[PDB]
Design a protein around this nucleic acid. Structure first.
Ligand SMILES: Cc1cn([C@H]2C[C@H](O)[C@@H](COP(=O)(O)O)O2)c(=O)[nH]c1=O
Ligand SMILES: [Mg+2]
Ligand SMILES: [Mg+2]
Ligand SMILES: [Mg+2]
Length: 676
DNA sequence: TGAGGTAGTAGGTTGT
DNA sequence: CAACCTACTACCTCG
């Protein structure tokens, strides 16, 4: 069904004939920069030149004449002083139709925007974000409201303003004044004298004048010598975690720290319904257009298509995965689950047992319920009891416990994993009428035991879909993959992740993970898939998939590679009527937006932005399959994830491995979704 | 640890 | 600089 939408973009004035002919400048650096320093040094010169100037080629493009630029100057970069001189090389017309020249024009537009926002008052400007009014406030804190903005140039050579309302949380208070108001220690804190932030561990209470530092001086006079007490009091010692040393806590002074505030530190919800968001968006667009002399905003329209609604199946039709609990699962198998109580009570709660029994009765499969009597505090004998349970056929464990600290949770999880037992935690103040929570725990539990709760019924170009992501927060990451195999997504599998330096997944790693998913399809179907759908979370780094793609071509398997971007897709509003789910909005060549999840009384949806990197499947069939796979996720009973199931799975996989470690997974079946 | 969503907070990787 | 990502917590509501 055809329809039309507004984007949160606004067409403004045509570029005047001066802006269409920017000045070019050649850069001469002394000494000449190295291969690694050249491109970022050019970017630095662009900023240092002043006016409105950006990198273009090996040089600069400016909307200021050279006479009002800082043409000669200095540049500090990683402890080295470069002298730069700019040589003007005339003006030259750029054409908005040539995408490269248009790209230089858009870069100049973004620069124009930042610089012109700097001259707004009295509002709070932070780069490309502006905050206009105060939304809420309290003892020592306040929440401003404004918008994040972008500016670029259209192919017809007119400005395009993107606007998205946003809130900002500010603390105009020292750590001392904050704590004196009765508030608890914030998790994060910031230097009052600079931008550097620390993680606040605790309050040391020893004397700051008798606290020696690594180097002789006491805390107090170290900060005094740097002229930081000039204007404020030192206050108490605070201990902050070393950003680059998790083992050696660092001393500091609460009088020189300022709390950084999150929602955890302050009842006011900050999302907007889409109608209100759109309204504010238009108001801010016209305000900006008028203040910056960009003209009157004209809203951009795009043709949008409504994709068919997927038909989810348990034993029979369902609308949600929680329905499989009453109606039966897609594929049931003989299962055994164990209960571990960390709360001091006895056996299975009756309603949980009843619900499990009903589910397996409807599914026509046999259920065995076990109880773990041993406690994890018993060290190795506990592992012995676990091994006895697994030996007796147990596939997963439900842990009924009071809320656990992250460290204890991770430890328990890992311990169970090492014996090949995935676990589902359910927190122990538990009421039978809290149905959503415990039913969701039951779904988690069942997916972790390797059951397939739901599947799709449609016809899709690819019968294997695989998602790739990277996770972890240390100096290294884990690159991983998860897949939905079969035309129905009838099996969900993860593969052992790999440690990598950063976000880029090595080519051979990509191929090895994919190959494992191909092999999974081989074991299920007894053949190779005719076509696979490759979903990369975020951008595809240069040639990351080249080896995998060729490898697939050598096997005669067709493919589509799709970059799935969670941000950057802007906003999508209906021109008329209600905002509905499953909107496919094509844009430029190979790219499109996809609104996958929305319901009333939520905030404004955030459409995915998708780029077809390789393959020849029509954009709409891709959009269709991705939208449908978004409904395959088994562990969320009542709300579908924004990302298609293989990517939601991959994300959670690498996240959990980044949390626990990869060393625990050797005996855990890849059909068991331990990370959900 | 119930889960997803949309929100906010911080910091990180890729590559001209 | 680019245009994206990580991962935490809060409230709302339960396809
Ligand atoms: C100079 C110095 C500072 N520090 C700590 C105390 C300061 O509060 C903290 C941060 O100071 P900074 O912001 O100048 O880096 O560094 C040491 O632990 N040892 C030292 O030798
Ligand atoms: Mg990612
Ligand atoms: Mg992720
Ligand atoms: Mg879970």
């Amino acid at each position: 069904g055809k329809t039309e939408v507004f984007l949160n973009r606004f067409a403004l004035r045509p570029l005047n004939p001066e802006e269409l002919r920017p000045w070019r400048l050649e850069v001469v650096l002394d000494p000449p920069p190295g291969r690694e320093e050249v491109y970022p040094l050019l970017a630095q010169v662009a900023r240092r030149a002043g006016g409105v100037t950006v990198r273009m080629g090996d040089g600069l493009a400016s909307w200021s004449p050279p006479e009002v630029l800082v043409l000669e100057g200095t540049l500090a970069r990683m402890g080295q002083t470069y002298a730069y001189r700019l040589y003007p090389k005339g003006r030259r017309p750029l054409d908005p139709k040539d995408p490269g020249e248009r790209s230089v024009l858009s870069a100049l537009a973004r620069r124009l925007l930042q610089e012109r926002l700097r001259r707004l008052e009295g509002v709070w400007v932070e780069g490309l974000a502006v905050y206009r009014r105060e939304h809420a406030r309290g003892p020592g804190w306040r929440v401003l409201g404004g918008a994040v903005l972008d500016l670029w140039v259209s192919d017809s050579g007119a400005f395009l303003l993107e606007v998205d309302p946003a809130y900002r949380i500010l603390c105009e208070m020292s750590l001392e004044a904050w704590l004196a108001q009765g508030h608890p220690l914030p998790k994060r804190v910031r230097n009052a004298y600079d931008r550097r932030t620390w993680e606040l561990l605790r309050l040391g209470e020893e004397d700051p004048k008798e606290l020696p530092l690594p180097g002789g001086l006491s805390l107090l006079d170290y900060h005094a010598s740097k002229g930081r007490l000039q204007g404020r009091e030192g206050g108490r010692v605070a201990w902050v975690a070393d950003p680059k040393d998790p083992r050696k806590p660092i001393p500091h002074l609460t009088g020189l720290l300022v709390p950084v505030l999150t929602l955890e530190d302050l009842s006011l919800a900050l999302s907007l319904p889409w109608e209100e968001r759109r309204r504010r968006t238009r108001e801010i667009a016209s305000w900006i257009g008028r203040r910056l002399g960009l003209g009157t905003p004209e809203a951009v329209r795009a043709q949008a298509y409504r994709l068919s609604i997927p038909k989810l199946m348990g034993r029979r039709a369902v609308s949600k995965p929680a329905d499989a609990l009453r109606v039966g699962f897609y594929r049931a198998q003989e299962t055994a689950l164990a209960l571990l109580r960390l709360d001091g009570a006895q056996g299975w709660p009756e309603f949980l047992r009843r619900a499990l029994l009903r589910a397996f009765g409807a599914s026509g499969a046999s259920l065995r319920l076990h109880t773990l009597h041993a406690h994890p505090s018993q060290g190795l004998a506990f592992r012995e009891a676990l091994r006895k349970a697994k030996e007796e056929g147990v596939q997963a464990v439900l842990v009924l416990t009071p809320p656990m600290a992250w460290e204890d949770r991770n430890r328990l999880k890992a311990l169970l994993l090492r014996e090949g037992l995935p676990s589902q935690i359910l927190n122990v103040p538990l009421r039978e009428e809290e149905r959503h929570r415990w039913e969701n725990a039951l779904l988690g539990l069942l997916a972790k035991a390797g059951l397939q709760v739901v599947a799709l019924s449609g016809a899709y170009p690819a019968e294997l879909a695989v998602g790739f992501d990277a996770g972890g927060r240390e100096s290294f990451r884990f690159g991983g993959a998860a897949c939905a195999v079969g035309g129905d997504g009838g099996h969900l599998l993860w593969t052992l992740p790999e440690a990598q330096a950063g976000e880029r997944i090595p080519q051979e790693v990509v191929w090895d993970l994919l190959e494992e998913t191909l092999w999974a399809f081989r074991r299920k179907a007894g053949r190779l898939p005719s076509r696979v759908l490759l979903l990369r979370d975020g951008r595809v780094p240069q040639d990351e998939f080249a080896l995998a793609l060729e490898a697939l071509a050598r096997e005669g398997i067709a493919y589509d590679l799709v970059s799935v971007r969670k941000s950057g897709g802007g906003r999508v509003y209906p021109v008329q009527g209600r905002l509905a789910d499953g909107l496919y909005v094509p844009l430029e060549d190979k790219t499109f937006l996809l609104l996958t999840v929305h319901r009333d009384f939520r905030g404004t949806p955030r459409p995915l932005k998708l780029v077809h990197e390789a393959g020849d499947t029509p954009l709409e069939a891709l959009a269709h399959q991705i939208f449908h796979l978004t409904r395959l996720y088994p562990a969320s009973g009542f709300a579908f994830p924004r990302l298609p199931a293989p990517l939601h799975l991959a994300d959670r996989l690498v996240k959990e491995v980044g949390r626990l470690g990869i060393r625990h997974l050797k005996e855990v079946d890849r059909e068991k979704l331990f990370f959900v």
